[PDB]
Predict the structure of Phospholipase A2 isoform 3.
Amino acid sequence: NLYQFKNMIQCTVPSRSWADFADYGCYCGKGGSGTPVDDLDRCCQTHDNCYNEAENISGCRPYFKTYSYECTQGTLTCKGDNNACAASVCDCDRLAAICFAGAPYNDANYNIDLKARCN
Ligand SMILES: CN1[C@@H]2CC[C@H]1C[C@H](OC(=O)[C@H](CO)c1ccccc1)C2
Ligand SMILES: [Ca+2]
């Protein structure tokens, strides 16, 4: 669920608050369209596409589905006690959190004008 995703990010990128990723580029956050603006935005596009896939699973609501995961000692793990939906969503979030940590953050790309720049 989104609370868990926030915590994955807080755990893989403790140097930056999480709100830093909540409205970035064309894909991080509410946004979902256009040319990704940089590598971090690409991490968000993959994440967004991963959620759209998970939504194909019956009753599967990625923002809301509570899954089972752990973050400690630098490692994030989706646990084996996850159903198909939980496992899929947990995987999307884990991959995105890892991606976020490896991607440069560009202050210029925070809170861009989606309507004009993401067609
Ligand atoms: C309800 N939340 C979603 C749609 C609008 C808001 C904020 C969104 O934020 C994100 O999509 C990013 C990137 O996945 C994110 C960053 C930090 C916490 C939660 C989500 C998801
Ligand atoms: Ca999005």
Summary: The chain has one domain: 1-119. The CA atoms of residues 4 and 66 lie 8 Å apart. Residues 2, 5-6, 9, 18, 21-22, 28-30, 44, 47, 63 surround OIN (ligand 1) (CB under 6 Å).
